[PDB]
């Protein structure tokens, strides 16, 4: 059917430490990249991280050559719409990635005001993003396929500014 | 016999590691030689 042995992920999603821990769940989690169950590999990126898992399928991510969790690229980091446009990947890339890719989700009780968890709340009790921007309006195939990619649109537009 | 027993246990059920990051490991989280 669909089996795997090791996750093809990026160094940003792998965690900011040489030693990590993986958890393999064979044939589960319903990977929507190929509509087939894959080995869901959960891990911990570090202290105060998101502790996410694998989302895309194994064979479905081999043709795209992107991360298992971030699903951007393999070496540069641009989206698939920006990678298929064009070196163009040398200038659009950026080393030392931000912690927002490994940051946890927001607290819905903090947005509602009744954050009864307190200082032991694992979620981030900060302000959410602006919904007027297209950066918080992506989808499943919108990030995987190059069609309707808002992150790739601003990457080619801001590349010619000065 | 061990290979046939592993296939029979798989049929009756249904019916550390260190990968060197040679993809993009240059400067982002440097020092990860074995990962």
């Amino acid at each position: 059917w669909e089996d795997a042995d090791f996750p093809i992920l990026c160094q940003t999603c792998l965690g900011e430490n040489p030693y990590i821990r993986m958890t393999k769940e064979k044939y589960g989690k319903e990977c929507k990249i190929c509509a087939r169950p894959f080995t869901v590999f959960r891990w911990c990126p570090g202290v105060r991280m998101r502790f996410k898992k694998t989302e895309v399928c194994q064979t479905c991510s081999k043709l795209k050559n992107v991360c298992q969790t971030c699903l951007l690229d393999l070496e540069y980091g641009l989206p698939i719409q920006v990678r298929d446009a064009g070196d163009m990947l040398l200038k659009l890339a950026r080393t030392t990635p931000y912690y927002k890719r490994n940051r946890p989700h927001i607290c819905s009780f903090w947005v509602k005001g009744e954050c009864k968890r307190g200082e032991e709340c694992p979620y981030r009790h900060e302000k959410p993003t602006d919904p007027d921007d297209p950066l918080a309006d992506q989808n499943i195939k919108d990030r995987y396929y190059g069609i309707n990619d808002p992150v790739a649109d601003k990457l080619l537009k801001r590349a010619s500014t000065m | 016999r061990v290979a046939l027993e592993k296939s029979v246990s798989q049929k009756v059920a249904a019916a550390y590691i260190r990968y060197t990051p040679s993809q993009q490991g240059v400067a982002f989280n440097s020092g990860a030689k074995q990962r």
């Binding site: 090791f6 430490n17 030693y19 821990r21 | 550390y16 590691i17 260190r18 990968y19 060197t20 040679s22």
Partner: peptide, 18 residues
């Protein structure tokens, strides 16, 4: 390229977290 090791998981998780 995967390359497993036969080291102990207890001493490895204790040394990296320290």
């Amino acid at each position: 390229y995967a390359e497993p090791a036969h080291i102990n998981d207890f001493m490895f998780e204790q040394q990296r977290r320290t």
